[PDB]
Amino acid sequence: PPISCPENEKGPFPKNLVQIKSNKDKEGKVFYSITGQGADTPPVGVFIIERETGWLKVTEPLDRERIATYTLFSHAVSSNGNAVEDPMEILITVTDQNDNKPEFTQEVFKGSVMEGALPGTSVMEVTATDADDDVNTYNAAIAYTILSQDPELPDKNMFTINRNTGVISVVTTGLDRESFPTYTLVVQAADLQGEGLSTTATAVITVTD
Amino acid sequence: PPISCPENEKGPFPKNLVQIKSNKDKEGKVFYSITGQGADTPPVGVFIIERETGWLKVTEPLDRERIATYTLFSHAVSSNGNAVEDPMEILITVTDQNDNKPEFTQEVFKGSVMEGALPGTSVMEVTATDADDDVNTYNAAIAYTILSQDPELPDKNMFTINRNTGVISVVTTGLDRESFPTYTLVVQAADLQGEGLSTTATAVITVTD
Ligand SMILES: [Ca+2]
Ligand SMILES: [Ca+2]
Ligand SMILES: [Ca+2]
Ligand SMILES: [Ca+2]
Ligand SMILES: [Ca+2]
Ligand SMILES: [Ca+2]
């Protein structure tokens, strides 16, 4: 039956995952071993099996973003030296931890907005990614916010950002490129729908006629 | 055979966990049910089992910090209405996500320190806890930092904090009650050994004669 193990586990190692058993203990003594990537081919020895007990262990932390599944085969051999069964497939699923912060595709996004743009007009878009597991978890679920605006004139909150899409809009009036030529917004992306790990970048908006 | 499920999974629900079998299905219909806290006692219906297929399922997201291990029992009953097995114990392990910030044990810690205190002199100790899995993960592994000091004289950094223990110490010279009787530090606790979710509190230090 399929086995799962979280990434990034603390020691001590090794750690038991499951005990393999041949119904062919009828033959007395069986010796167990495993093959596959993560066993006897690279990366070698991430999993091992106790020869006599059949205990299948993990020997170090896993990393879902590097390898997310392993396919091993367990072998069972008599003391006279013959395989007593065909190799049995084992499937190991690495489950995700929130160990990647969202990462903005650029450090500085640049856009422009026209004087007299209607309140509610889209201006530009910022984008972050998150390497964590977006299928099974919220570890990659990104909310966008604005942290600050420089300058704070003529109003402190000239703009808003859609917390899902990262589209920035102008939401009030009084753009004037001859007094305040640009706006520099610090934007944040945070996973767990905004409550999780975060980073920031900058969006710089040029005011046009 | 031992089963696990991450907390806080996305749907859709329900999700298959494992299929229970009796080798008594040779004879005819077996009907499957489960008892225990999480099944028929509180919280009720978190796990169900398909009567015919014996597919054990989970019906909603789990919260490890509510219940981290469930002990259920599977029952198997002939279509004529007799138990064809002893009830069989099922252990479900709920594996952790980092969804709890550290939390200081109080919002304001107090300490005092002689103005004639040598650099390296312990002043006080702040303390946080984290409800996540401190045994298997780093999701509750807290690192303490200082974020701010007030006032910022005679130096901005009159104190340092032990990353691991939260012990605060005098780091430099010039403690003087009459000029500055009171320092107010903002301290922070963050999990994943400092890289993770974070909270802040305050330490208020009095300079004594
Ligand atoms: Ca990882
Ligand atoms: Ca991850
Ligand atoms: Ca993430
Ligand atoms: Ca939880
Ligand atoms: Ca935590
Ligand atoms: Ca948790």
Side-chain angles (χ1 to χ4, degrees):
Chain A
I3 300 161
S4 80
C5 189
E7 64 172 343
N8 301 349
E9 288 217 313
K10 298 216 300 211
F13 297 93
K15 288 183 207 260
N16 290 331
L17 291 178
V18 77
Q19 193 168 10
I20 302 309
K21 271 152 220 190
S22 205
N23 48 82
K24 316 280 187 111
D25 311 353
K26 332 220 148 201
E27 292 187 4
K29 282 177 186 188
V30 172
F31 308 149
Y32 290 100
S33 51
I34 44 167
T35 51
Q37 307 176 292
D40 71 318
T41 64
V44 174
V46 176
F47 304 94
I48 57 172
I49 199 160
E50 272 176 27
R51 274 268 298 298
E52 315 228 289
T53 69
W55 272 104
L56 175 74
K57 309 159 172 259
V58 63
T59 70
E60 62 183 44
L62 310 182
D63 173 11
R64 188 201 69 81
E65 280 78 44
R66 181 179 288 287
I67 306 175
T69 56
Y70 300 87
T71 301
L72 311 179
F73 285 85
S74 69
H75 305 253
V77 179
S78 78
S79 57
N80 255 355
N82 307 112
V84 315
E85 281 180 341
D86 302 331
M88 296 295 283
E89 193 183 47
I90 295 179
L91 172 67
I92 296 161
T93 305
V94 187
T95 61
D96 185 54
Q97 293 288 324
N98 194 18
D99 68 322
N100 294 274
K101 308 193 153 150
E103 178 190 351
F104 277 99
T105 57
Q106 308 172 24
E107 295 190 12
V108 181
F109 298 86
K110 290 182 183 174
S112 71
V113 65
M114 176 193 325
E115 287 176 4
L118 286 165
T121 304
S122 296
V123 171
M124 65 183 292
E125 184 174 343
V126 303
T127 302
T129 57
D130 193 299
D132 288 321
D133 179 2
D134 190 61
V135 175
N136 292 303
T137 79
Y138 298 87
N139 291 338
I142 290 167
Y144 299 95
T145 52
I146 297 171
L147 299 194
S148 67
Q149 171 194 300
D150 185 16
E152 299 169 359
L153 296 157
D155 188 288
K156 175 173 165 131
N157 296 112
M158 304 284 301
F159 301 98
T160 201
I161 193 161
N162 178 308
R163 58 181 288 120
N164 296 323
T165 71
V167 172
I168 298 164
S169 294
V170 194
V171 294
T172 188
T173 54
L175 295 166
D176 176 18
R177 81 187 179 291
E178 294 173 74
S179 303
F180 316 109
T182 70
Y183 291 93
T184 305
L185 313 175
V186 178
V187 290
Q188 177 181 286
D191 59 32
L192 299 182
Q193 308 177 277
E195 309 291 347
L197 304 174
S198 71
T199 63
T200 62
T202 295
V204 182
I205 295 164
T206 294
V207 178
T208 64
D209 78 349
Chain B
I3 295 130
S4 75
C5 186
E7 69 165 334
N8 296 347
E9 293 216 302
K10 309 227 266 208
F13 292 91
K15 297 168 190 287
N16 289 338
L17 291 187
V18 73
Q19 194 179 11
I20 312 312
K21 300 175 174 188
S22 290
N23 41 351
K24 308 286 163 288
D25 263 307
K26 323 297 168 144
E27 318 209 326
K29 274 160 212 181
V30 180
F31 296 145
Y32 294 108
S33 54
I34 45 166
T35 59
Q37 315 262 7
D40 70 320
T41 48
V44 176
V46 174
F47 300 95
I48 64 185
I49 199 170
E50 222 156 26
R51 297 167 45 244
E52 309 220 57
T53 67
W55 268 109
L56 184 68
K57 297 166 179 248
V58 60
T59 64
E60 59 185 42
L62 303 172
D63 173 11
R64 202 203 59 92
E65 282 74 47
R66 192 208 199 163
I67 296 173
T69 58
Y70 292 86
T71 300
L72 309 186
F73 281 89
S74 66
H75 303 254
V77 171
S78 76
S79 75
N80 258 0
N82 306 306
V84 302
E85 300 271 18
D86 302 63
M88 275 171 303
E89 201 193 41
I90 295 170
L91 180 66
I92 306 173
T93 298
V94 181
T95 67
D96 190 45
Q97 296 286 344
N98 191 24
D99 61 339
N100 291 270
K101 298 185 171 155
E103 291 293 317
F104 281 94
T105 48
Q106 50 199 99
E107 256 178 353
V108 182
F109 300 86
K110 282 170 170 72
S112 64
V113 56
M114 292 178 330
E115 58 179 359
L118 297 190
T121 313
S122 296
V123 173
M124 57 190 298
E125 156 165 29
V126 300
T127 307
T129 68
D130 191 304
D132 292 312
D133 190 347
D134 59 295
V135 168
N136 296 299
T137 78
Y138 287 99
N139 291 338
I142 292 164
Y144 302 100
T145 54
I146 293 153
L147 296 199
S148 83
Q149 180 197 290
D150 192 66
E152 301 189 302
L153 295 164
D155 191 45
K156 36 164 187 165
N157 295 116
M158 300 294 294
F159 305 94
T160 208
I161 185 155
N162 187 302
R163 212 196 156 63
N164 292 324
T165 59
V167 164
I168 296 178
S169 290
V170 190
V171 160
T172 201
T173 55
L175 283 194
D176 186 56
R177 181 183 74 264
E178 44 264 81
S179 39
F180 311 95
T182 291
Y183 289 92
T184 296
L185 317 189
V186 175
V187 294
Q188 170 176 287
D191 58 37
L192 296 182
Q193 319 175 274
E195 296 305 324
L197 308 181
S198 76
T199 178
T200 57
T202 289
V204 170
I205 295 155
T206 301
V207 190
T208 68
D209 204 36

